[PDB]
Amino acid sequence: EGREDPQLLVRVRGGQLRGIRLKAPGGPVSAFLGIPFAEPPVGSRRFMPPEPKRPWSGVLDATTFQNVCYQYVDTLYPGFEGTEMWNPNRELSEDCLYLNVWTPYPRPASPTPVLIWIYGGGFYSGAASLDVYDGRFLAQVEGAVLVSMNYRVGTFGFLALPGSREAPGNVGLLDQRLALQWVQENIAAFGGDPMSVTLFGEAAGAASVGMHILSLPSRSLFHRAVLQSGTPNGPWATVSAGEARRRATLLARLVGCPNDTELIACLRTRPAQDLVDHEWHVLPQESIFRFSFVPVVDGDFLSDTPEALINTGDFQDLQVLVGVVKDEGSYFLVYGVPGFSKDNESLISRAQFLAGVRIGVPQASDLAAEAVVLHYTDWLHPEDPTHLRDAMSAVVGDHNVVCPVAQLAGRLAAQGARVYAYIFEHRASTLTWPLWMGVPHGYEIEFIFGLPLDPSLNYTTEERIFAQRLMKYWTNFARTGDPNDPRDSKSPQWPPYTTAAQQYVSLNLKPLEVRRGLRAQTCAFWNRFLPKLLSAT
Amino acid sequence: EDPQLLVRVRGGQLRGIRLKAPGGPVSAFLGIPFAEPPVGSRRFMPPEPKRPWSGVLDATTFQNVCYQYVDTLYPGFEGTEMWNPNRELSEDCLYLNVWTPYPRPASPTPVLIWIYGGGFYSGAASLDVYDGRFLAQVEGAVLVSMNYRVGTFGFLALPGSREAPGNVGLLDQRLALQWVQENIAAFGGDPMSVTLFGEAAGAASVGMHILSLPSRSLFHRAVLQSGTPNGPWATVSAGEARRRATLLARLVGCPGNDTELIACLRTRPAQDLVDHEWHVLPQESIFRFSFVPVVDGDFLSDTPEALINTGDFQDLQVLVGVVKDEGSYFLVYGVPGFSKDNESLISRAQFLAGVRIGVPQASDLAAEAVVLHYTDWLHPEDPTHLRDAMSAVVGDHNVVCPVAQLAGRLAAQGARVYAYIFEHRASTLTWPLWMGVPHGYEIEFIFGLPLDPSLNYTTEERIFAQRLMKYWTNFARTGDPNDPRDSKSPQWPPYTTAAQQYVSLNLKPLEVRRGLRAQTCAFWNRFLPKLLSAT
Ligand SMILES: CC(=O)OCC[N+](C)(C)C
Ligand SMILES: CC(=O)OCC[N+](C)(C)C
Ligand SMILES: CC(=O)OCC[N+](C)(C)C
Ligand SMILES: CC(=O)OCC[N+](C)(C)C
């Protein structure tokens, strides 16, 4: 050193770091990218819990994103931005346990509230390095310290032989928890306040956040929580120990691995790509919005099912912001429901709808699927292909996201939590998906992170202002447990969600509007009636 | 001797009576026998045609009311008593009534035949609300109404027996219908233009005549108000009628072997039979009736469901409808928490318990499905919502969805169907406001009672009754309730399975709506049965 920018040199527990001055529209920010927080989970360490990173000598370069965790790469629409923006943007490697930090430049002189991002992608994909997760805007405009981590996905993250030592399951969640521990020890070196840490995440990232809420060793590592379009409860976020065993064993067979020790040892000899090549061959039914390797109810990380834990938990101390986008299901329809495509209007027949329901509600008996169809049919125009297309989307959206979230918000509020709920209804003007998909899963993230503030991205002026409002809600919540601006009143208030009033807000170009009841009639169908059909048949 | 009031029918001569309607005279012939009294050994038996008589039969007065249960829930209260017998009870009750214009119509006039309701356990053609005076005077209609046997007398069946074969009260109706074919021309009626109409059990009866072949050559058009042959209450199986008859017999000390059991039942005074009429139902219930038409494989060759699903209805015109609050009336007759004397604000607990009684045949799982569907999840515990939903459950299950199913099957199988919902609450109604527009309270408007100034209806209601009398009689004339001279009201379109159009009848002009409680009736008509099947 001696000739470098003295504001980019920072020491952490493992040693010295050098970061990079980045440009944001309104001025510079500090970034520290690819900081290792675990020993590379390679070789004999595959499937194993992470071990904390051993200290390095000299100055670690933290100026570039590190490798993305080994994962399936989407091939449905090759060249198409709508899917490619979610694809890995760095080399795939099992050596991938790194985190990123953005802070004001120069670094804040007083302890600053910290936001920790956890990406989604079904627990089989994702990366903290994608463009839509760029922390520079929140850092620059809000003065926030933003942290994001890679965590293992797919088999590498979630393959489990429950009860074994060598593959106990949930290790991707343990990667996440280790990064939270890293923030506790080190974030003050960056001017971050370890006593004000807010988790946020979308989809599987949101289920992750919820699992940290429900897991006692994680509880002391953060203070507030944001869950966007995902929950730890519901039909996809977890599996039974028995089902996890069954999927691990089948995958083992499919790659030529015929006592748990022997089987796991043989899996550890397999090239990473082989595991990925076979990970979609283990699902019990033809399905969408189901993922092969996900958190498992081990009776350890998750001491009971997420359902049981939200029903009996004490959440007096907790503050949560939860919400959904207007069209949660539409995205998933093109990945497996015959009749659906990005390249046409996807008008479908009644027959194609009944077939779609079986794929979208894969665990449903015949009677249960008939209930779904009868509920979502418009009996005034039962054959209308536009209505049938839109109902198919709502089925998948309600079943996997909207009603799981409605449930969570009710259970948390009944048991002491301060809960704020939203529905995000603005379709980005630069969206490349067709109009029929409305406001698809994942397409609020862009706005929360402040991308429209970059003039080179071609968003409208209104979108720029709208993004600034949302960043303000998110960071006000991180800061105080309350998204409302303390100073400004009469400009509409966001009231807490309660069981008695069921209030939530619309997020769009218009000022906040307060609505009551989150899909209340339909979610009574999913959350109260459908289960009772099962546990009686 | 007024020559207008003197008629020769096939069985001899009759003398009627000049009655006064607000607009002028009408001729009435009340208490005309159409069958041999069904007494002694004829109890439970099909009716026999009335033997000829000498001289002039006096037909100036209503005859006895068929022997039936008399309501005692609210003694002296007009809202219940208006349906109670207004003449003496007697098993000797097979008589009918004819109103015609005065003077007698110069050319053959369309004929309307009224069939009363009363759950198949009660009713009479002599009630004030069934007065044919107004329709005769204003519309020039020939109006006919009969007594038919109710309760055990009309519907106690031991299926396959010769002495108590079931459905005799429907056969009573059929005989009155045959009498109209043979005799109505002498009164100026057109036997080639006969429209049946009826309400509740009367509408179910009209529907049973639609579904029974020997009845079909006896009328040309049909109106079913608030009732259907299909649904949960209008019929029972042979097995279930046998059981109820066998149980009642046991309760009155009779006696194994049909002949013997039926002979012993015939020795029993009428009131002994009625005394135990309400001790044979399988469940604690409301909107259920002990003795009703039976699926005998004869009058009804298969179930009403089977017959409407497979029938050919191409030559048929039908008018069907419901009132806005079909179920409210019934709740005070057995659902804890409900009374006419207060607002009936109930708890959630009272709502779940109320559902088991309103849907008595429902399994635990089906009951929950109903509760979950009718709960408003924004206001799950609000007493006003819970009360109104209880009413709605009972109305939909028993009348609205049964009607929606019938309307749909008829339209699809070639019938011409017009549907309505009746939404005006009579200003003179003695029932409380929370009951809204209850089961049975459209009848007085269609019969035209608001036209009697002594009765204290509003001017609005008089104009409104005139509109309804016109739709009903237009329908009788042509099979289309639209006025063929008026150039738009707007027009009442036919009900079809595609468009599902029906009209609201109230003080405002006709409004066309689409879909008769479509989402909720899918639940009852499509989902609940599938829940029955698999469980
Ligand atoms: C988008 C999505 O959920 O993909 C799952 C199906 N897959 C991985 C085989 C394409
Ligand atoms: C649907 C899926 O599996 O991945 C898309 C990326 N996501 C969920 C973060 C928007
Ligand atoms: C009013 C009604 O339909 O109930 C009949 C049975 N009752 C009155 C004997 C209890
Ligand atoms: C209590 C009962 O079932 O009958 C009421 C009279 N009715 C049905 C003609 C309106």
Curated annotation (Swiss-Prot), chain A:
The active site is at A203 (acyl-ester intermediate), E328 (charge relay system), H441 (charge relay system). It is a peripheral membrane protein. InterPro entries: AB_hydrolase_fold, AChE-related_enzymes, AChE_tetra, CarbesteraseB, Carboxylesterase_B_AS, Carboxylesterase_B_CS, Cholinesterase. It holds the Pfam family AChE_tetra. The keyword ATP-binding does not apply. One of its GO terms (biological process) is retina development in camera-type eye. CDD domains: Esterase_lipase. Keywords: Cell membrane, Disulfide bond, Glycoprotein, GPI-anchor, Hydrolase, Lipoprotein, Membrane, Neurotransmitter degradation, Secreted, Serine esterase, Signal, Synapse. It is found in: Synapse; Secreted; Cell membrane. Belongs to the type-B carboxylesterase/lipase family. Isoform H generates GPI-anchored dimers; disulfide linked. Isoform T generates multiple structures, ranging from monomers and dimers to collagen-tailed and hydrophobic-tailed forms, in which catalytic tetramers are associated with anchoring proteins that attach them to the basal lamina or to cell membranes. In the collagen-tailed forms, isoform T subunits are associated with a specific collagen, COLQ, which triggers the formation of isoform T tetramers, from monomers and dimers. Interacts with PRIMA1. Terminates signal transduction at the neuromuscular junction by rapid hydrolysis of the acetylcholine released into the synaptic cleft. Synapses usually contain asymmetric molecules of cholinesterase, with a collagen-like part disulfide-bonded to the catalytic part. A different, globular type of cholinesterase occurs on the outer surfaces of cell membranes, including those of erythrocytes. This is Acetylcholinesterase.
